[PDB]
Amino acid sequence: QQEALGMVETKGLTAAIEAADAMVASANVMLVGYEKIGCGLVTVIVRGDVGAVKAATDAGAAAARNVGEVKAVHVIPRPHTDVEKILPKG
Amino acid sequence: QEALGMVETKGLTAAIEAADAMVASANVMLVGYEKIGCGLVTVIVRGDVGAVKAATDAGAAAARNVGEVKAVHVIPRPHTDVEKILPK
Amino acid sequence: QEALGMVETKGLTAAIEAADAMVASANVMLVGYEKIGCGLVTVIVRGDVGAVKAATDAGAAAARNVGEVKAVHVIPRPHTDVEKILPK
Amino acid sequence: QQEALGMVETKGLTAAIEAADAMVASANVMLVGYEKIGCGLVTVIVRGDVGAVKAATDAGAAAARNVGEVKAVHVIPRPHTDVEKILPKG
Amino acid sequence: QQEALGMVETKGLTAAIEAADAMVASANVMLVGYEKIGCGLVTVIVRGDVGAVKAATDAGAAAARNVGEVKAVHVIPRPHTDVEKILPKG
Amino acid sequence: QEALGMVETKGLTAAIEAADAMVASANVMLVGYEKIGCGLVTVIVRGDVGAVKAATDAGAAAARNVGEVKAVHVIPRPHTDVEKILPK
């Protein structure tokens, strides 16, 4: 019953924006937000159906890797508290 | 009895994976995140000593597949009350 | 048609030079700056695809004489509305 | 007449929290606070009787060194303006 | 009709303050402000007549280089939108 | 006559030791601290040129036993009024 969670972390904001844009191409994936965490790292987070999020994060990481470095790509299909409990800030 | 668990990662994504696993792996409450620079993020949980011990281990393990884990530690009973010592 | 342009620099001064040149070099609106740590600064502009393409090229070029350029990129049409995807 | 001042600086928050916890074991030592200063550095600060603070900072640094790196341990026995003048924020 | 824009970027705040002080020696140069951008980098910005700003930034960089590292010195003689449009915060 | 003194350290603790010593070592007022990233902290004092000169020397010396000192400098008379040039 929980939406899935998708992350793409990049070094560089531009890569993260490219990532985000690509991830939201598919209209069933909502962009939760960015998170700066220092030393140029930016984490783009998206919510949605497991398969969509899977496809989106892959698409996002792919888009991003042509613009700057990609430090992580990960999907959490069934978050264990509410998405909001486990996230810090949209 | 009641305790504090930490997993510190380089990368937010690793920390989120850590957090999710820690909640999944035992009856522990997720206190929260803390950014401290250069991509380091500290996930913190409260709960029963054994649960927290199991959760932090599970969290660090999950996390290590996503990014780097810089620390894993449990404080089995904090010397001011369990959250007094946290800054958050 | 309508688009997004980015020039990321190490150094604020390089980013300001970049911004100034981007505005000079075509009919493009300067959205703004974003600091993301360790001296990295991302200048962002909106406008017509070709203008933004020309501006980002001009901006990166200007900037490279002042400090390091870490990225130059154009998103010719952003998939939420042009500013929806930006955090600023 | 001034309380003494104790510092333990660590790379890593977890080390600093361990440090703080250990330092406050002794009920005559008050924890002033944490200070993040970048690149993972965190400074734990405590106030109290000179001897207590001496003992606490030593205990804290010790606790901490098993969890992450310790970058400084220092005691200022008699601060020269008020503790509050010389500190930035609790 | 636009004022010119002068920048001196330093690693170290002390260098930047020395830079700023030197730049404002000449009464026809207004100090816009500082900007921290991470990893010890600080950007001092000044506004004024093209020649003054030219002279000031040179003087500032010079002063600064004896105190810490100078990462950039640059003058934009005729900013293309208003100075305020192209700047982030005084 | 009236002046500005700076000691920049890597580490807050070194900066606090520096500050304490600077106040101890002469008739100088402590303006304040400034964090600027990667553990760098700049302690600033105002006062009589000679006092500030003596204090900054004393401060840097104290500090060097605790952590790294990145800069020591005195501006004997600031060209806008003594605090105008500071950002704090």
Swiss-Prot record, chains A, D, E:
GO biological process: propanediol catabolic process
Pfam families on file: BMC (PF00936)
Entry-linked InterPro entries: Bact_microcomp_CS (IPR020808), BMC_dom (IPR000249), BMC_shell (IPR050575), CcmK-like_sf (IPR037233), CcmK/CsoS1_BMC (IPR044872)
Effect on the protein of changing K54A: Slow growth at limiting vitamin B12, wild-type at saturating conditions
Quaternary structure and partners: Homohexamer with a central pore of about 5.6 Angstroms in diameter. The hexamers pack against each other in arrays. Interacts with the N-terminus of PduP which targets PduP to the BMC. Modeling suggests PduC, PduD, PduE, PduL and PduP interact with a cleft formed by the C-terminal segments of 2 adjacent PduA subunits (on the BMC luminal side) in the hexamer.
Record note on biotechnological use: Artificial BMCs can be made in E.coli by expressing pduA-pduB/B'-pduT-pduU-pduN-pduJ-pduK (in this order). Enzymes can be targeted to the BMC, and appear to be encapsulated within it.
Induction of synthesis: The first gene in the pdu operon. BMC production is induced by growth on 1,2-PD vitamin B12 medium. No change when grown in the presence of 1,2-PD, ethanolamine and vitamin B12, suggesting it is possible for both the eut and pdu operons to be expressed at the same time.
Domain commentary: The C-terminal 14 residues mediate binding to the N-terminus of PduP, which encapsulates PduP into BMCs.
Effect in UniProt of substituting L87A: Decreased amounts of PduP in purified BMCs
Pathway: Polyol metabolism; 1,2-propanediol degradation
Family per similarity comment: Belongs to the bacterial microcompartments protein family.
Reported phenotype of the disruption mutant: Cells do not make BMCs, diol dehydratase is found in diffuse aggregates near the cell pole; it was later found this a double pduA-pduBB' deletion. A single deletion forms larger than normal BMCs; it is not fully complemented by protein produced from a plasmid. Grows in an interrupted manner on 1,2-PD and vitamin B12; grows for a while then stops, then restarts as toxic propionaldehyde accumulates and then decreases. Increased DNA mutagenesis, showing propionaldehyde is a mutagen.
Organism: Salmonella typhimurium (strain LT2 / SGSC1412 / ATCC 700720)
Protein name: Bacterial microcompartment shell protein PduA
Keywords of the record: Bacterial microcompartment, Transport
Gene Ontology CC terms, in alphabetical order: propanediol degradation polyhedral organelle
Outcome reported for the amino acid change (mutating K36Q): Improved growth on 1,2-PD, makes slightly larger BMCs, alters accumulation of PD metabolites
Function, in words: One of the major shell proteins of the bacterial microcompartment (BMC) dedicated to 1,2-propanediol (1,2-PD) degradation. At least one of PduA or PduJ is required for BMC assembly; it must be encoded as the first gene in the pdu operon. Not required for structural integrity of BMCs, it is required to mitigate propionaldehyde toxicity. Controls diffusion of 1,2-PD into and propionaldehyde out of the BMC shell; residue 40 is particularly important for pore permeability.
Comment field (misc): Bacterial microcompartments (BMC) 100-200 nm in cross section are formed during aerobic growth on minimal 1,2-PD-B12 or anaerobic growth on 1,2-PD-tetrathionate medium, but not during aerobic growth on glucose, anerobic growth on glucose or pyruvate-tetrathionate. BMCs can constitute up to 10% of total cell protein.
Domain of life: Bacteria
